[PDB]
Symmetry: C2
């Protein structure tokens, strides 16, 4: 019974960061400050542990006591599919509180536990495809910070810095409310043009614009991007409208990648394929409720001969990318000229996603998700 | 480098069996005789091994030397996805010799190797869903053996025996060439009716008839089955005709399950979903080239809210069934009144798929595929 789960624990601690979020949830660089971060730990009878990180609300006591502990405690930790399905079945009746984000952090901690228990990196446990992968530099949403990302030229200058670092692909997130004047298609296209001019024709370029443009605006944006040879347009319209995406994909030559934020996990993503609503599928550990359903999405896409680009940085996403073939990139970011991404997090002793000078991220040969957790730091900076 | 593959070995040995195959490849009971069986073994630097069984031609020296050793020797055995994709890429140029059956046994041996190395059952390594599952009793193709499966009544009598054993589902394979008079739709329906009459309304019934009936014959067969409340009709037409299956499914109320034998792995099975060619998907370790692509097919199906019924007995298929939710049964057979399935194989010390008196097969808690191999027997009965 050494494999039986005995504890589900949450530790909230302060991390020091310059990352802030605006009222709509977009990240920007700001003053250094302390932000509450949560670590979920699952422990088995033999004392083995697995861990994963998320925002405190996602693993708050209401959710832990009412849902997570009831499913997990006393169960064989290796039954990840049964445990995931148990949580999935409880979402409908959860009064909107058992979210995909909660499923995701639980699933990740269980994968980390299995990997740590076996001394195996998660992607090797899944069945490895690649030990390294090209990353694209994923640039923060636009701002109104002088010399930051305030002008099209600012994007161009930052792109030059990213190319020098070794990135072979770059994705712009352009300007969104509450940026005072945003959004504006012509401005977004000017940023895209400045980047293409700055980096030349052989660096791959992508854009993730304001996520709720009208059909007419997204059409204008996409048509403008085709002149610049961009690789994809990402979430330019409200993803709750599958029909809008079929229409836009049919009208644009440039590949449309999606859905990123839409709910419904792998099930709903099958509908995007069935309806021809995108040319490249999207998934993400946080978007579909864990590594387990993210793998399902990757396989779904591959069966249709499609790529499925994995949304988000950090180990959990990197291991999905490393275990699968049909994905061009790991998403490395968000990035901003005021910040050095390689500084990492104060609660991790080393990067989960180090990138060489040629633009390849190498998956750390460390057990589980391979997050090099500074447990002492976390204990010294505990909130609750 | 303990995880690096050092050897790929094939041992051909004689198994004593009463199973014979007719000219079309359908199994029937016959005289006890010795049949050549092959075991593929993959070994790593640390001496750990994984094994899987197949027919000798599938792992003959041509295939092993030209394809398998070149991909595997010197590689990290845990990179199952990379190694599978490497073999898949070589199939096109293999002059038709590198078959899905060869990919399957290799993938299975690699899974067994990982599981044995880690002391973990394969389904637990994948991420467990269930430790037991209902089995249906899968009856051999019809014959002309008196008291065997020669008449509709013979199927009825055998079905009574299967129900007493504990099976909660039964699948008939009916009469096929070279049975002298076969095939005949009315005879197949009479067997189906005899079984329904024998077992009553609460045992689930399925039929896998002659695999190449015309559209008109398959339609008559399916319409006849609806009167008997059968759960599915399986491969009644040439599966190379996807369009015939769309037509048949649209015409029948009874669920059509497929494709079983069609090539193209998970890629082609996506086409069966896209075209609405079946109501229930089918996969199988031997049919799609391994546990790895079988899992992909299961996930593909689940994303569409469909079931995917796993073709074939033995550990390799049982572990797929145990790791996934969207499958009603493990297929236990082929079965015949002249044979006791629970006798098992002379080269295995115990059953990989023991079934209780309530009809549940319990996955053995043994590492890897959990095949209880009698290595001594194999050594004593070696051919080459
Ligand atoms: Mg995005
Ligand atoms: Mg298009
Ligand atoms: Mg069949
Ligand atoms: Mg129908
Ligand atoms: Na967007
Ligand atoms: Na058939």
């Amino acid at each position: 019974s050494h494999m039986i789960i005995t504890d589900v624990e949450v530790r909230v601690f302060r991390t020091t960061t310059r990352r802030h979020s605006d009222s709509a949830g977009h990240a920007h660089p700001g003053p250094a400050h302390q932000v509450e971060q949560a670590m979920l730990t699952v422990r088995t009878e033999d004392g083995q542990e697995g861990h994963s990180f998320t925002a405190p609300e996602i693993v708050r006591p209401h959710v832990i006591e009412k849902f997570v502990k009831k499913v997990l405690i006393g169960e064989d930790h290796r039954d990840r599919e049964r445990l995931w399905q148990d949580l999935a079945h409880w979402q409908r009746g959860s009064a909107a509180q058992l979210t995909d984000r909660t499923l995701a952090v639980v699933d990740c901690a269980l994968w980390d536990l299995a990997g740590r228990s076996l001394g195996q990196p998660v992607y090797k446990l899944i069945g490895g495809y690649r030990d390294k992968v090209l990353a694209y530099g994923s640039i923060m949403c636009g701002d109104e910070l002088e010399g930051g990302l305030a002008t099209p030229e600012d994007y161009g200058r930052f792109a030059e810095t990213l190319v020098k670092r070794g990135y072979k692909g770059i994705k712009l997130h352009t300007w969104m409310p509450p940026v005072s004047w945003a959004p504006d298609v012509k401005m977004d296209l000017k940023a895209c043009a400045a980047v293409r001019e700055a980096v030349g024709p052989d660096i791959r370029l992508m854009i993730d614009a304001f996520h709720w443009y009208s059909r007419t605006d997204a059409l204008a944006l996409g048509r403008g991007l085709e002149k610049l040879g961009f690789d994809w347009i990402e979430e330019p319209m409200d993803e709750q409208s599958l029909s809008s995406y079929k229409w836009l994909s049919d009208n644009l030559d440039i590949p449309v990648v999606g859905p990123e934020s839409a709910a419904g996990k792998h099930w709903h993503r099958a509908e995007w394929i069935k309806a021809g609503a995108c040319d490249i599928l999207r998934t993400g550990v946080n978007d579909v409720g864990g590594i387990t359903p993210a793998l399902k999405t990757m396989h779904l896409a591959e069966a249709f001969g499609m790529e499925c680009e994995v949304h988000g940085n950090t180990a959990m996403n990197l291991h999905v990318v490393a275990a699968t073939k049909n994905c061009r990139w790991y998403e490395r970011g968000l990035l901003h000229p005021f910040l050095e991404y390689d500084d990492g997090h104060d609660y991790l002793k080393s990067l989960s996603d180090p990138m060489d000078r040629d633009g390849f991220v190498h998956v750390p040969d460390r057990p589980g998700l391979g997050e090099d957790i500074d447990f002492t730091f976390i204990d010294n900076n505990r909130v609750r």
